[PDB]
Design a protein around this ligand. Structure first.
Ligand SMILES: [Ca+2]
Ligand SMILES: [Ca+2]
Ligand SMILES: [Ca+2]
Ligand SMILES: [Ca+2]
Ligand SMILES: [Ca+2]
Ligand SMILES: [Ca+2]
Ligand SMILES: [Ca+2]
Ligand SMILES: [Ca+2]
Ligand SMILES: [Ca+2]
Length: 1510
């Protein structure tokens, strides 16, 4: 399908998206999860490689491996920040190998890899996995590659918790060069380059010292910085100086900080800051180009220009947030010179220098041209009455011109005349400008580079049209309007037409030589990019279909963010336009509108969207005061006309204002034809009347301490506002009410007031007994306007009610079901108004109200679990009420909560009136109270169902020696990428694939207390002090016959079949916690000591003495025994705590399972159903109740025929046939026939049963993420677990699986070193200087402190020869699953407890030259990896350099496969050229034995008995 709709479908145009707190610019919880897996092929002579990872301002060190050139670390570090995304993305990640770090000194740098957080956020999964960090020495350009570090860099934020790959077996033969740590497209041969940032001059500075400023410019790149000279006493300084950075091209930290700063000894402080995002001024590849801009200007914004000793708006000067005023403008430039590393002439340092750059004339940026900003304040209202009833003016200022107080022919005036406001209501004023709308005019001089803002205008105009299409499409998926794919193809068709229009409009007048290096290449790149996105748009039009409108929206959002990235040209010309409320000549509130949407052009695409048009500037509080509780109320709201352009072009600067005005001008400007006025006067005025159809509200903000509201609301429009009736004690008011503002006064015959009406503010208020009315949020609106000649008829009128989204700030706070119609009072008066169908309160007329239809609400009252106290008091007799559309019922009381928490009457029902329109149902309001005597109904909680769509009922249609961990490790290999049976590793919670097991038992949450903001509050779980278990079933009041057949009408149990007994049934519960991954640390060593503590009912189990210490990916393997009674007790946490020596044991994370939903589900989530039956070994069947009898139980409870066992090999459930292996072995291996394999196969085939058919729960290890009340929103880990549920009325549980962690196989390695040859003669003779070598060999498997044994010394070799025949002995533990040697030791010498570790198996033969008086002198080394060491040469002649280089001429051996290898091996060192070379050869005999083979064949140390050596 190709056909499309270019116009807007939904009525989102009457719903503005105005918000004072966009969450993309506010502080947010961000987490950095780093790992250092290993390192390989690093450059250095006998080093101790520590890998240090800094993020931004703090660093965490890895533990020190010793004497290794291919080490292995495998630990986890976690960094926490609560900053805005721009502060977060500018932090630097420096994976740098250092060595020999000690207790007062930093280590010697080997090499560093730099990558900012902005690039490690921008992957498709926000991370790199198993990637190698290319290191390089910063102190020398000519130094080579210094090694590679395996890592998983990863950065996440609160929001979309995007997954990490689960840590399976890692025994891959990985190549470094195929898995380098690089994004898409960057070549790995990154070359040194010098970053010349040329800073020429600045203009327009404010006062900053007292009457004085002393500026300079400081530039930041990748943690390096460099600042120019101090220009003393100059508001228009001049440096013409370049700062010389040097960093590897292309840069992996792609954002630059320029900043003008006042130099001061007392308070050195930022004046302004611009962020040159390098992603748009550079490119890579065949069409790529070097990072460049300039000679061009840039505009910086920040705090208020007036001088203060301390400022709370200091964050805006440092580039954070959005500035409230102009600060300065700075001339800048950039060019990159790629260094020739083979040239010996240049200096070797990459250090930042300052130099005098080549200056350019002022004509290189275009000649100066004069500009003109004109304003006309048509409306001003909703000034906050807490500001006072002082007269209100508005100061407009662009740059510094027009700032009549602080802005260091026509004389410009920028302040409207002061005049008294008039009261609209108790909270808001209106400025009574009436006919005399004031005006301003400003003359400013800026350099003429309008083409930059013209290109940015076309790009951001395309971006605004695409964003309007994105929001329109998204809101019409939500509101379920017809045919989304036509609207997506229509906005994409308009995208292709916009690409074609940009391809034929931005290419004009290319002959201007002032166009810089960035300008021409950026125009060419945007031509190419919009051509390619026209082609991609035409392809994506075919890509979107009937099934993919919800996931190609991600590609459309990618197009939108790329267009916004293209649109923000960092080369600025015209600084922004600022409006400022004034009282007593002091600042209150601000608006900031960018200059390009005000900039004038003949063609519409280059013309700004706000030029010659009226804009609704909702003025915000400046700085920190504009968010949260400090900025709750609307500070002001304008309807302000603004025009910006050339004074040569200002003939049409009055055309967008409403017609019917006359001009009154200043005393120095009387009589001239083109002098702008200081105030208009309107002879034309229209009478108007707006009807606020305020019918309903849903999902509102609870502003009372009972989780409730008394919501009326005040509807605002220009000068008048009225309140609806205060409905008492509901979160869903139904006012059914028409407010009517009469004799309203518009002024002027506006062009298309139908399409752009004045805005309607609506604010909701919770009335209390004090007389206060709490601020329950704010929504915005536009009325549908009928003229006197216009008819009141479909499809336009009447104003059908829609959902208008209320925000208390950044946080969402509900919807209004409301609508508005604005009507002019014509020549006939009120006669041409629409007809009006309780006293003064008028009802909502027909055609506007929802058409009510008769329904029936049948509700299951299952019970209540674990209600908290009402501030001290126990609840023990609760009764549940229902409020829905004026009707409802109340159930029977719980007469004894301490023994039966269930209601006596299980189903109660009533009839109700609900609207025919399927999105217009009110929220059905469960309201559980505590039914005491004397009318003391203390409210327990209230649940408002968001939509009844969940509840509308419609009728249906050795290889045999295997532990546990073999069939865990095989299954984790399956999901990451027939000898072992496999379970199902669920990577998320088991709820997420099984619809949370709420087939009929839907848990509702009893909310009390006020809802939370993002500030000083709580989101969801604190309001849930207790939970209601039950169900709803709402359908149209004729009961269908098929609904009665398949759902059942019982006089006490209606619309709920398959119900179980409500009476208590005892259940034995046991919890296998398998493992955990990615845990949050809780100690000063960067690690945690997790133990599992379980809460359920009366039980309080914590494992204080049996933790799994110092392991961020712990092996738990523990089963805990708990008894609890169902359905009353399922408050179950499988929780993880770090044990501490002093103080309490900190909670790492926890999660809730809610076992009553698991037990009563038709999925049978009581215990896992295995893939294969056995009675023996590791695959032994779990349930005490055998699978044939489980099939019998689920045919009994499920009401289906079966099981029909014939022979032992087949079964029938319903009309299907299932088969399986009839014979099973026991522990002795003999065969017995049984029914259980076929029943287990039938159990895994239960989904395709024709009626009751349900995929039952397999044997799982489900992976629940951890959550913390201290730091919610992000994961504190990925715990993995599965649980048992077996009732006491049925066969009792047997002995559990041996879920103890895997015992390591015991081995011993005996390595006799025979001889050596061709060792280079390092030690000169003390007297004659003849070269020699005191040869002895050093070898170990794990480390120095455990394994190292030293061969005796062959003194004074002549050519490299030597004879030892000295035998090593290394006893070690080993598992072949992860090729990890297992060993328990303490982490430190003051450690309290021991800890299991894992390190790879490797024999490090190393020649050494021994001295009796000093430290040992290195000769050569080979790291023989014990599954990748090369084939040993038969002679010393055959031993060559191919045994370590890239060629495959010597293949590899596993000693665990071969068990005995003789050969000669080379031992290497790196020269000053950083290449490997021969420094010696050794002869060796590696023999590996098991522990029993070593015990039955004992040998002595070195050359002694038993089995002596010569
Ligand atoms: Ca100063
Ligand atoms: Ca209140
Ligand atoms: Ca109240
Ligand atoms: Ca702790
Ligand atoms: Ca601890
Ligand atoms: Ca503690
Ligand atoms: Ca020596
Ligand atoms: Ca020596
Ligand atoms: Ca020495």
């Amino acid at each position: 399908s190709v056909t499309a709709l270019t116009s807007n479908v939904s009525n989102k145009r009457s719903k503005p998206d105005i918000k004072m707190e966009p969450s993309a610019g506010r502080p947010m919880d961000y987490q950095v999860s780093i790992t250092v897996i290993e390192a390989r092929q690093l450059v250095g002579l006998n080093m101790d490689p520590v890998v240090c990872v800094e993020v931004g301002d703090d660093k965490k060190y890895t533990s020190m491996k010793e004497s290794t050139n291919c080490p292995y670390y495998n630990e986890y570090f976690v960094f926490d920040f609560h900053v805005s995304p721009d502060v977060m993305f500018d932090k630097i990640i420096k994976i740098s190998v250092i060595h020999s770090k000690n207790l007062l000194r930093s280590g010697t740098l080997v090499g560093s890899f730099k990558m900012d957080v902005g690039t490690v956020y921008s992957q498709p999964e926000h991370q790199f996995h198993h990637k190698w960090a290319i290191l390089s020495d910063p102190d020398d350009i000519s130094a080579g590659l210094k090694g590679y570090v395996k890592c998983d860099v990863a950065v996440v934020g609160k929001g979309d918790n995007i997954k990490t790959p689960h840590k399976a077996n890692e025994t891959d033969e990985d190549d470094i060069e195929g898995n380098l740590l690089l994004p898409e497209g960057v070549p790995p041969e990154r070359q040194w380059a010098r970053f010349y940032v040329k800073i020429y001059r600045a203009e327009g500075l404010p006062r900053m010292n007292t009457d004085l400023v002393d500026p300079y410019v400081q530039v930041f790149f990748a943690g390096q910085k460099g600042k120019t000279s101090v220009q003393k006493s100059s508001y228009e300084p001049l440096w013409n100086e370049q700062v010389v950075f040097t960093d590897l091209f292309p840069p992996l930290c792609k954002r630059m900080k320029v900043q003008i700063r006042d130099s001061d000894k007392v308070n050195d402080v930022a004046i302004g800051t611009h962020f040159i995002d390098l992603r748009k001024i550079s490119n890579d590849g065949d069409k790529g180009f070097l990072p460049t801009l300039g000679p061009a200007w840039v505009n910086m914004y920040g705090s208020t220009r007036n001088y203060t000793l301390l400022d709370e708006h200091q964050d805006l000067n440092e580039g954070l947030g959005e500035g409230v005023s102009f600060r300065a403008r700075l001339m800048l430039g950039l060019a990159v010179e790629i260094l020739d590393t083979s040239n010996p002439e240049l200096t070797s340092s990459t250090e930042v220098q300052v130099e005098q750059a080549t200056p350019v004339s002022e004509s290189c940026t275009g000649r100066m041209e004069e500009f003109f900003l004109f304003g006309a304040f048509l409306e001003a209202s909703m000034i906050d009455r807490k500001n006072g009833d002082k007269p209100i003016t508005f100061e407009v200022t662009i740059g510094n011109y027009g700032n009549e107080v602080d802005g260091m022919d026509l004389a410009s005036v920028s302040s409207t005349p002061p005049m008294r406001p008039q009261i609209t209501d108790r909270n808001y004023f209106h400025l009574p400008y009436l006919e005399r709308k004031p005006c301003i005019y400003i003359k400013s001089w800026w350099p003429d580079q309008r083409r930059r803002l013209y290109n940015a205008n076309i790009m951001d105009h395309i971006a605004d049209k695409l964003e309007e299409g994105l929001n329109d499409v998204q809101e019409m998926i939500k509101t379920e309007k017809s045919y989304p794919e036509r609207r997506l193809r229509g906005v994409l068709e308009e995208l292709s037409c916009g690409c074609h229009r940009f391809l034929s409009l931005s290419d004009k007048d290319q002959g201007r030589s002032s166009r810089t290096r960035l300008d021409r290449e950026r125009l060419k790149s945007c031509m190419r990019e919009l051509e390619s996105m026209g082609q991609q748009a035409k392809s994506l039009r075919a890509q979107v279909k009937r099934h993919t409108v919800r996931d190609k929206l991600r590609s459309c959002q990618n197009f939108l963010q790329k267009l916004r990235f293209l649109a923000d040209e960092p080369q600025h010309s015209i600084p922004d336009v600022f409006i400022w409320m004034m009282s007593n000549n002091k600042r209150i509130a601000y608006a900031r509108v960018p200059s390009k949407d005000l900039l004038f052009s003949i063609v519409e695409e280059e013309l700004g969207k706000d030029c010659a048009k009226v804009k609704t500037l909702f003025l915000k509080l400046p700085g920190k005061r504009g968010f949260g509780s400090a900025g709750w109320t609307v500070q002001a709201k304008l309807e302000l006309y603004l025009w910006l352009g050339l004074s040569k072009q200002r003939k049409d600067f009055l055309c967008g204002l409403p017609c019917g005005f006359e001009e009154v001008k200043a005393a120095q400007g009387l009589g001239l034809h083109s002098f702008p006025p200081i105030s208009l006067v309107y002879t034309k005025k229209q009478a108007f009347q707006l009807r606020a159809h305020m019918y309903q509200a849903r999902s509102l903000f609870a502003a009372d301490s009972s989780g409730l509201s008394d919501p009326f609301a005040r509807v605002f429009f220009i000068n008048q506002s009225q309140c609806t009736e205060v409905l008492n004690e509901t979160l869903c008011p139904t006012w059914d009410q028409m407010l009517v503002f009469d004799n309203l006064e518009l002024y002027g015959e506006a062009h298309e007031l139908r399409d752009d009406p004045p805005i309607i503010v609506i604010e909701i208020y919770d009335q209390d007994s004090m007389g206060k009315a709490d601020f329950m949020g704010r929504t915005f609106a536009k009325p549908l306007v009928k003229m006197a000649d216009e008819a009141y008829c479909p499809p336009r009128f009447p104003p059908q009610l829609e959902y208008y989204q209320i925000y208390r700030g950044s946080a969402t706070a509900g919807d209004l079901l409301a609508a508005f119609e604005l009507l002019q009072i014509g020549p006939s008066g009120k006669a041409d108004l629409p007809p009006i169908n309780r006293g003064p309160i008028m009802p909502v007329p027909v055609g506007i109200r929802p058409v009510l239809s008769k329904y029936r609400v049948e509700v299951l009252f299952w019970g209540l679990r674990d209600l908290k106290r009402v501030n001290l008091a126990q609840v023990d007799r609760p009764r549940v009420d229902i409020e829905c559309a004026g009707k409802g019922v109340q159930s029977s009381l719980i007469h004894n909560y301490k023994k039966n928490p269930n209601f006596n009457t299980l189903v109660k029902w009533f009839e109700v009136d609900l609207p025919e329109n399927e999105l217009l149902h009110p929220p059905l309001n469960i309201r559980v109270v505590d039914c005491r005597a004397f009318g003391r109904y203390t409210l327990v909680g209230s649940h408002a169902v968001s939509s009844l769509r969940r509840f509308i009922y419609r009728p249906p249609d050795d290889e045999s020696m295997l532990d546990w961990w073999s069939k865990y490790f095989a299954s984790i290999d399956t999901m990451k990428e027939a000898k072992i049976d496999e379970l199902k590793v669920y990577p998320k919670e088991l709820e997420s694939e099984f619809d949370s097991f709420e087939d009929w038992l839907h848990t509702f949450n009893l909310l009390r207390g006020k809802t939370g903001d993002d500030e000083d509050g709580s989101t969801e779980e604190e309001r849930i002090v207790g939970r209601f278990k039950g169900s709803l079933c709402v359908y149209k009041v004729p009961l269908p016959e098929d609904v009665s057949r398949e759902a059942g009408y019982d006089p006490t149990y209606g619309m709920f079949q398959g119900i179980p007994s409500n009476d208590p049934i005892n259940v034995l519960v046991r919890i296998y916690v398998v493992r955990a991954t990615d845990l949050h640390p809780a100690d000063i060593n960067g690690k945690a000591d997790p133990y599992i503590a379980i809460k359920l009912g009366k039980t309080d189990i914590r494992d204080k003495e049996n933790y799994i210490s110092k392991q961020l990916n712990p092996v738990f393997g523990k089963s805990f025994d708990i008894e609890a009674s169902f359905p009353m007790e399922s408050m179950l946490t499988v929780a993880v705590y770090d044990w501490d020596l002093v103080g309490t044991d900190d909670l790492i994370g926890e999660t809730k399972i809610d076992l009553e939903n698991r037990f009563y589900s038709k999925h049978r989530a009581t215990c896992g159903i295995a893939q294969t039956y056995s009675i023996h070994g590791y695959n032994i069947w779990r349930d005490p109740m055998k699978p044939s009898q489980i099939l019998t139980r689920l045919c009994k409870e499920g009401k289906v025929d079966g099981p029909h066992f014939g022979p032992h090999g087949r079964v029938r459930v319903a009309n299907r046939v299932f088969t399986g292996p009839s014979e099973i072995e026991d522990e002795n291996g003999q065969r017995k026939p049984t029914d259980e394999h076929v029943a287990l196969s039938a159990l895994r085939h239960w989904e395709d049963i024709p009626r009751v058919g349900c995929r039952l729960v397999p044997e799982h290890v489900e992976t629940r993420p951890l959550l913390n009340p201290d730091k919610p929103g992000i994961e504190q880990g990925r715990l993995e677990l599965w649980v048992d549920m077996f009732p006491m009325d049925m066969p009792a549980p047997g002995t559990p699986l041996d879920i103890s962690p895997r015992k390591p196989k015991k081995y011993e390695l005996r390595v006799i070193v025979w001889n050596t040859d061709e060792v280079v003669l390092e030690d000169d003779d003390f007297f004659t200087g003849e070269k020699s070598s005191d040869i002895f060999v050093r070898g170990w498997l794990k480390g120095q402190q455990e394994d190292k044994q030293d061969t005796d010394v062959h003194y004074h070799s002549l050519t490299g020869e030597g004879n030892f025949n000295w035998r090593y002995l290394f006893p070690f533990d080993y598992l072949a699953a992860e090729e990890k040697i297992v060993m328990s030791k303490k982490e430190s010498m003051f450690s309290w407890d021991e800890t299991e570790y894992k390190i790879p198996a490797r024999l490090t033969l190393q020649i050494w030259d021994a001295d009796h008086f000093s430290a040992d002198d290195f000769l050569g080394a080979i790291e023989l990896d014990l599954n990748r060491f090369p084939r040993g040469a038969k002679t010393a002649k055959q031993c060559t350099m191919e045994m370590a280089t890239g060629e495959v001429d010597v293949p590899l051996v596993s000693i665990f496969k071969q068990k005995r290898v003789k050969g000669w091996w080379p031992l290497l060192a790196r020269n000053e050229n950083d290449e490997f070379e021969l420094t010696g050869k050794v002869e060796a005999e590696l023999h590996l034995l098991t522990a029993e083979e070593a015990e039955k064949n004992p040998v002595g140390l070195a050359r002694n008995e038993p089995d002596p050596l010569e």
